Paper text:
Kainate receptors (KARs) are a subtype of ionotropic glutamate receptor (iGluR) channels, a superfamily of ligand-gated ion channels which mediate the majority of excitatory neurotransmission in the central nervous system. Kainate receptors (KARs) are tetrameric ion channels that belong to the family of ionotropic glutamate receptors (iGluRs). Four TMDs form a cation-selective ion channel, composed of the M1, M3, and M4 transmembrane helices and a re-entrant M2-loop between M1 and M3. We find that blockers reside inside the [name] ion channel pore, intracellular to the closed M3 helix bundle-crossing gate, with their hydrophobic heads filling the central cavity and positively charged polyamine tails spanning the selectivity filter.
The intermediate affinity blockers, PhTx-74 and KukoA, showed hook currents of intermediate amplitude. For NpTx-8 and PhTx-74, the extracellular end of the density had a bulky cap, which likely represents averaged conformations of the blockers hydrophobic head, while its intracellular region included four prongs, likely representing four different orientations of the positively charged polyamine tail. The bulky hydrophobic heads of NpTx-8 and PhTx-74 occupy the central cavity, while their polyamine tails stretch nearly the entire length of the selectivity filter. Based on the four-pronged cryo-EM densities corresponding to NpTx-8 and PhTx-74, the polyamine tails of these blockers do not align with the pore axis but instead lean towards the selectivity filter walls adopting one of four nearly identical positions in the pseudo-4-fold symmetrical ion channel. Compared to the starting pose in the cryo-EM model, PhTx-74 dramatically changed its pose during the MD simulations to maximize its interactions with the channel pore and formed several hydrogen bonds and hydrophobic interactions with the residues lining the central cavity. The resulting pose formed contacts across the channel pore. At the same time, water molecules were excluded from the central cavity. The tail of the blocker formed hydrogen bonds with the backbone carbonyls of Q621 and Q622, which were not present in the cryo-EM structural model. Overall, PhTx-74 formed fewer interactions with the channel pore than NpTx-8, explaining its somewhat weaker potency and stronger discrepancy with the cryo-EM model. This example of discrepancy between cryo-EM and MD results illustrates limitations of both methodologies and inherent differences in conditions, including temperature and averaging due to local symmetry.
Residue numbers in the entry:
A (entry chain B), B (entry chain A), C (entry chain D), D (entry chain C): 429 to 874
The structure:
Amino acid sequence: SNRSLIVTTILEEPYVLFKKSDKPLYGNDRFEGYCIDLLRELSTILGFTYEIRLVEDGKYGAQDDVNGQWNGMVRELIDHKADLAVAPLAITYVREKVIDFSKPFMTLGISILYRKPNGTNPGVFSFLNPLSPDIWMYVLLACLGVSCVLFVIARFSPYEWYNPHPCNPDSDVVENNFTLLNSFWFGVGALMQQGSELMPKALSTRIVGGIWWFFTLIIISSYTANLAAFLTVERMESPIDSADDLAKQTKIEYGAVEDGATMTFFKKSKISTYDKMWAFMSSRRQSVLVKSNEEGIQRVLTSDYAFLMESTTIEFVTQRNCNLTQIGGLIDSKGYGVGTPMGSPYRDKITIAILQLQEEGKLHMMKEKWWRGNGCPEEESKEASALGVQNIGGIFIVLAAGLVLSVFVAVGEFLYKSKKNAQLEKRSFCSAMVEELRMSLKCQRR
Amino acid sequence: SNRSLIVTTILEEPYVLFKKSDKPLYGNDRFEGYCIDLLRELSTILGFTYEIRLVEDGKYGAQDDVNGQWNGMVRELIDHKADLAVAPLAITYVREKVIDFSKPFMTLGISILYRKPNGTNPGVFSFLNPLSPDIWMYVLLACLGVSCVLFVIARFSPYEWYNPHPCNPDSDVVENNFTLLNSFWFGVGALMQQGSELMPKALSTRIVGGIWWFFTLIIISSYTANLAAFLTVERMESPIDSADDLAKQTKIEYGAVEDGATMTFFKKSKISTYDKMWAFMSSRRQSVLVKSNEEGIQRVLTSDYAFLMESTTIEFVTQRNCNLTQIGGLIDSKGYGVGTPMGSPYRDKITIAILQLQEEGKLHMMKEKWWRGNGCPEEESKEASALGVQNIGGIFIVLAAGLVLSVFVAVGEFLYKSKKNAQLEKRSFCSAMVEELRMSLKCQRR
Amino acid sequence: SNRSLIVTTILEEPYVLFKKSDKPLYGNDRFEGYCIDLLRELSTILGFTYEIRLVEDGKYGAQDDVNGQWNGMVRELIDHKADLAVAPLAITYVREKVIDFSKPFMTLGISILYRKPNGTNPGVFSFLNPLSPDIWMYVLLACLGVSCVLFVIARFSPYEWYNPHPCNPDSDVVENNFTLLNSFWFGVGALMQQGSELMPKALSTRIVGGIWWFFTLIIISSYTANLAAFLTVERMESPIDSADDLAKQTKIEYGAVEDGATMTFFKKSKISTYDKMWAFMSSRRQSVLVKSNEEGIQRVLTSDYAFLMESTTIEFVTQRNCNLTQIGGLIDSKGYGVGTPMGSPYRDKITIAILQLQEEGKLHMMKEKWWRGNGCPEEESKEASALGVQNIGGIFIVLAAGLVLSVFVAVGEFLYKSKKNAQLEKRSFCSAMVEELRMSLKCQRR
Amino acid sequence: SNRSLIVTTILEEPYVLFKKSDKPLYGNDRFEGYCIDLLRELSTILGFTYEIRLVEDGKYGAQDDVNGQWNGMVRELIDHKADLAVAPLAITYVREKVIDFSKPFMTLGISILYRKPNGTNPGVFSFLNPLSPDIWMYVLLACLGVSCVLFVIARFSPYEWYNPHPCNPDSDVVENNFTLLNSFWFGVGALMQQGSELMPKALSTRIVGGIWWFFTLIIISSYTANLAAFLTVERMESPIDSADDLAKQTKIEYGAVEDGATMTFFKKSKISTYDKMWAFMSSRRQSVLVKSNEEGIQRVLTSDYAFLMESTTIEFVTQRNCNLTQIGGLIDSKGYGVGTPMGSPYRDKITIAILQLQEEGKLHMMKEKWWRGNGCPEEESKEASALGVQNIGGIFIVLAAGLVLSVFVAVGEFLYKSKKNAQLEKRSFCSAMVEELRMSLKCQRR
Ligand SMILES: CCCCCCCC/C=C/CCCCCCCC(=O)O[C@@H](COC(=O)CCCCCCCCCCCCCCC)COP(=O)([O-])OCC[N+](C)(C)C
Ligand SMILES: CCCCCCCC/C=C/CCCCCCCC(=O)O[C@@H](COC(=O)CCCCCCCCCCCCCCC)COP(=O)([O-])OCC[N+](C)(C)C
Ligand SMILES: CC(C)CCC[C@@H](C)[C@H]1CC[C@H]2[C@@H]3CC=C4C[C@@H](O)CC[C@]4(C)[C@H]3CC[C@]12C
Ligand SMILES: CC(C)CCC[C@@H](C)[C@H]1CC[C@H]2[C@@H]3CC=C4C[C@@H](O)CC[C@]4(C)[C@H]3CC[C@]12C
Ligand SMILES: CC(C)CCC[C@@H](C)[C@H]1CC[C@H]2[C@@H]3CC=C4C[C@@H](O)CC[C@]4(C)[C@H]3CC[C@]12C
Ligand SMILES: O=S1(=O)NCN(C2CC2)c2ccc(F)cc21
Ligand SMILES: O=S1(=O)NCN(C2CC2)c2ccc(F)cc21
Ligand SMILES: O=S1(=O)NCN(C2CC2)c2ccc(F)cc21
Ligand SMILES: O=S1(=O)NCN(C2CC2)c2ccc(F)cc21
Ligand SMILES: [Cl-]
Ligand SMILES: [Cl-]
Ligand code: NA
Ligand code: NA
Ligand code: NA
Ligand code: NA
Ligand code: NA
Ligand code: NA
């Protein structure tokens, strides 16, 4: 039982944080978190003691690049003012050349924050979803096709040519109701579950009308049934799915903390996907390169934005907030190791100790204690809302579109009729004045 | 004949209870309850007289860790001051080392107390729900709009003025069926999937009719599919029926008595479901860990609070408050036994006595006597799966409101025609008197 | 460390059973189960040793009623041939008077086996489910009611009386299409989404027809939406729910093992529900009173039958087989205690030991190890089957019923018309021969 | 310059591999793979020559409990026969006590190997599914039946023979519209929710029509509601995506290698999800615990088997077999490191070397080189939510089969009328030649 060990440590949530209680200045009980619970079972396997001491700089450690000076915790490991450095101190090439790390107690990497998909604006259309766009086109080609065959069959069939005007029998007038215009109007009216004023006689034409009724009944029942499936089981999806899916889109925008461990990866990279991801950030600096992790979560949360930080911080924030999600897998591969002065014998002993608690399964149990939050999967048979102008509303567009198209056809009917009346009258403006007065008579006859 | 026995009890209810009556100075006639009826029947078959005596405190028994000594009824037993403890004194491992219980006379455990679900109150006019209130107004404005467009287009188009009376050909009259009243009746009849007796013949009016048919096909398929979603997700709504169903939720919060036997179970627990239940309550142990059972029941009423207590008190308060119910089975499993000093020659004679009263069904009849009180107006018609008068309901109100409105219009048609009839021949009223006559003819003449 | 303890034990699953392996005659390792794992942690808390020995009778123990002789395990406890009796040996009044039991390690009682509900025959009807039977009656009273008002409004309105035969204008004929027969035919045809040949003019009657179309559209959309809820979420239920629900029905039938611990409860009972349950079994002996537990499970499984055994055996069988379920709660209240000779000091030591393992939570962990099976909740979004003659099929009944009713009305139309033709002809059999030839002309005219 | 270093490896792939080539007698040019590329790049920056040497056995290393000594590559290190072990030698707590690893060059864990879902093959004519094949036949027999009943009832009823040509009143002709062809056309048009041009007028035929309207209202509402159920439950079908999703199931069975590092994890586990996974596999440890990784992959193909192995081999075989996939993330967390004797002056120089190759991205480029092979034809269009040509499909076949059938009937109508036309005036063919002429008139005349 020698003298106590000085454990240098920075404050990070959920790694090391102050306890929320009264009666201040506990002393060695002022702290809790993951690294405090990790230190407790290191003091059970090995034998040593505390005076957990915070770093007087609030930094991890880096290179001054002119002085040759080290900062943060690792400056307190070079000059022997501390003994251990149980903290999120990542194992790096430039750090291992000046201190010693144990084997990792936590793996991590670079991943993506993005706002969780919501299903608030599916489109002012997308009542049109439950049938594929091939099916919406194939029912026009069926409706145009059946209407053309119904015109041909009705002219070719003898039993469709009947005697009109049964008031006066024994005449020599013979009519056919199926014109070309009336044959489209049968197929459109049957398709809309409405029925037209004319109905096929002459059994060859009733098989056409009868098989088009069975086609129509299945199509509309399949539209209603698949729409009820969409409105009951809401299955949402994200625009982006990986890093290369973010490497192509320009609408969603990138982002990382400036002068951090994540920005240095994309600067030094040579992968063609990750080289494109840095040509963005080198151009659009002061607009995507945030200066802290706490600020960059807000720009995901407010703006339309995707943020690049470490994966253990994503796994902590996305348990607290339910607006947020993780996109894709991992990009880098790093580890958190217990710092140690160079040449110290405590490196190989903690390496034994971490591997013991890993086989027992206690590092998994510590992490589940400090990273699980409320969780919010919400496990709910998706709460049905009233259907509104953000769900349907394209039918209000195509209704007003078809009522504008009908005014143009009404003028084209008015000019073509007035051209034929002017064939027995003056040039063009006589019959334009003759016909427009008749509607201004405001009477039922003539 | 020997000395009478001194028995300690404790003022919990229904166990012992001051008898609400006048005329004081009783002996042990002050007391009544379950444990008084049990001590009466144990006396008649073992042959002893007894003197009931409340303990000092209102404490069952616990070991003060500082003093190392016990308090309450287990202190009266261990000091040989009393020799029976007929009370809700739970058989515990720490209590069995200092006194001797008999075999149990009552079996219990930990269960969850929660408010009975108030219901739905579906809000007759609940059929109006699958669409937004703006959607019901926009469809009502679209039907008035299309009917005003169809009136103008069919008026100005020359191809709608056909020849009426085709039974007399080669006459010279033209008639437009699309009046103002007939244009609303096209749009109403197309909206309701029915079909009016009049059909568009020009191409300009077959665009208005054809695009209004596609509008109503989407609206009615959207109403049916979304109403299917509302009715499917509420059959998937299952109420909470387990402690594990409380584990996944954070909306309904837990609660227990601080420093009780129920709270002690969740600390020592190693079940992962019950560990999450303590990971909840250890975080919020200023709001949810209530002081007493009386305060915990009041919070189940005036909150969304779920309370954890023993099963015998849940089975007592839910017989006397039909707002409350019991969710789930039993979590723990313990029992009540009478208390004796260690080495007493009565832990075996009472075990014979309790087993004799269990074969004869007297323990069951004593529990029905004191735990059932004033049977509930419960009336479980909760299964409620079919649509009923409380569900649709209001489609009969708007029906009967429409039948009354049409009678006032039929009076207006009867008076406006008769006033025009009395404009030419009659004066005011004898035209109306003879018009009631022709309508009273029992045939299709006049 | 004295001599070894002789533990007498019977074979029961999942209590004590032979291990399934080769290399026979292990010796003290030939057994496993619940009671073997219970003995293992009794030998950890206390200190003793085995020679687990089976009973040479295969019984528990009872009274010979003439010899005064005891059988089973408890005969080996009276005569000191064994030391402990770790087995399902229930604590009974007649057993405690001759041996000693510890405190219970397992609670149990009497409950009910019954076959799990299936949803195979919902009825040849019960397409009629999604609306309540009040709603099915209120739409007849609406259809009969609207048809009566439509008859009254159309006769009272002037604008419904129109001029027929537009071939010949300027006439003095005035017709009304709304008879009493035609007014029911409008309301029936509108209700079935079909439309009749006549349509209301005269705005007061169009409000009647327009508000009946909106009534019809909501009713049929609500039928289709609630039927889709029933076919998606299959929520089954049982005929019986408790013991008193079995105390009234005569279709499902009772049953218990003859001359067992469960039959003796219903014989000795005095509760009015349980007294009725024995008047059945005393009458219908050799038909419901089975003679083993293994046979009585088959009669639940094959016949229509409800079986009364112990609840721990129900909780074991219903995890193995998925056809079976448990009905209601518990009826009796018993316990399994470790047997012990009278006056032995090992009773109070095991009582300490069982209460220690209960506070640690190990009896719950042993029971979950030996009673959980596959479980089969099946957790499946209920597999939709094709709809068949066991689901619908009542519509095939009411179709054939209405086609038989229509033949009776066709004769009643034929006799009433032939009565009116015979008013201008002979008595009754002239016009019966006149009319029947006209249909045998097989021609379109006359 | 010093002695060359002796490095032990082991024949696993992609790690070391005999180079498939002719011309034997190589040195260490026999070998290629990931660990050969790693040992090459560690040599160029640490400056040493090396001789590769397979170990003796094909064993990594394990401690025989009888002998107390090690075997395999860890035996070559502990006896100082070799001094490098560049191999998949996982860093283990028991291995770290006898040798010295470097920091990891590869991170891995336990994951689940399972066959990629083959799909649906919906079976075009899949719209025919919500009703039984007997139901589709009984509706087809009911439509033929009601149409034969309606023909007989409307013939024999006197109230159907109305007066045709009402435009000429007081004539003496009667006509029945219900012919045989018109009676099928009523029943087909009522079945398809359309409306034929003919309506029943007698009460006997309005019972046939009114009960056939109620039949088709239930049939079509049953088709739509049951098709909504089929399409809703398959959107609730989610594939297995976790180890916990395997825990609830017994249909898909587990599997691992007996006496491996993966099997050892589930024995020592205290997670309740993983304990059920071992409670499965310890029961069935003759079928599912397979001998090798090669036999376990073959059982994933030709069974419903899910296999538990390390992540690097799952990521290798799923790049070369698109029938296979990886479910879930990682369960364990371990790593591969090079092996040194205890106290060797190379565990630190290689840790510098591996961290240098990780900053320069060379470890990532070496893993892409040997784990990606011949990129998959994957083509994930699995989202497949809308109904498409593979879903309905066959309603276009039965449409086009009905359009072809009607052309053969129109030829039969053209020949039967002309043969009756050539019965009176013409002989055989010149009646048919002039009938093609009148149908070729571009107007409604002849
Ligand atoms: C059961 C019914 C039977 C009756 C059928 C009757 C015929 C019906 C014919 C339907 C034909 C339509 C085929 C288009 C399908 C592709 C969808 C699309 O890309 O939309 C996109 C383009 O946004 C748009 O412009 C909407 C698509 C065209 C609408 C304009 C014509 C209205 C169609 C009706 C004509 C009315 C008149 C016809 C009748 C008189 C917007 O969709 P989104 O979701 O917001 O964005 C994601 C797009 N994505 C999902 C593809 C990725
Ligand atoms: C969207 C629709 C709009 C159109 C509406 C049109 C009017 C429709 C009028 C419907 C009126 C029917 C009301 C009965 C409701 C009670 C159910 C019942 O008890 O059934 C039981 C009795 O078994 C039977 O006999 C069936 C009930 C009567 C059927 C015979 C008349 C046919 C009804 C149609 C008339 C056709 C002619 C009318 C049209 C020309 C069997 O049901 P179960 O499930 O097997 O057993 C459990 C019973 N339980 C669930 C109650 C516990
Ligand atoms: C493309 C737009 C702008 C103009 C199209 C003009 C079309 C729709 C017009 C011009 C000529 C018209 C036809 C002229 C004559 C007749 C005969 C009559 O008994 C029925 C209507 C019918 C058959 C018309 C139908 C509509 C018609 C074909
Ligand atoms: C109850 C069954 C057995 C017999 C009922 C007889 C009923 C349905 C019959 C007998 C008299 C019949 C009416 C006699 C005359 C006419 C006038 C005609 O222009 C339309 C049909 C109509 C209005 C008939 C409708 C049907 C009718 C009312
Ligand atoms: C195409 C082959 C296989 C079938 C036989 C030809 C069919 C289509 C023909 C042959 C006899 C024909 C019928 C003969 C007489 C009449 C009466 C007339 O007022 C209406 C048409 C009607 C009812 C015909 C309909 C068509 C008909 C049924
Ligand atoms: O800094 S390390 O000890 N060595 C380098 N790497 C590797 C990429 C394999 C990793 C990967 C994951 C870690 F947790 C640690 C390390
Ligand atoms: O205090 S006891 O006599 N022994 C412990 N238990 C057990 C559940 C085993 C129970 C369970 C219910 C009781 F009523 C008594 C007891
Ligand atoms: O045989 S016992 O020890 N004493 C009698 N009873 C009771 C009815 C309370 C019970 C109830 C449950 C048990 F587990 C044991 C017993
Ligand atoms: O053998 S290690 O160096 N130390 C233990 N673990 C840990 C998960 C903490 C891991 C995890 C991944 C590795 F690559 C190495 C190791
Ligand atoms: Cl006892
Ligand atoms: Cl190391
Ligand atoms: Na170092
Ligand atoms: Na005791
Ligand atoms: Na006894
Ligand atoms: Na080591
Ligand atoms: Na539906
Ligand atoms: Na649904």
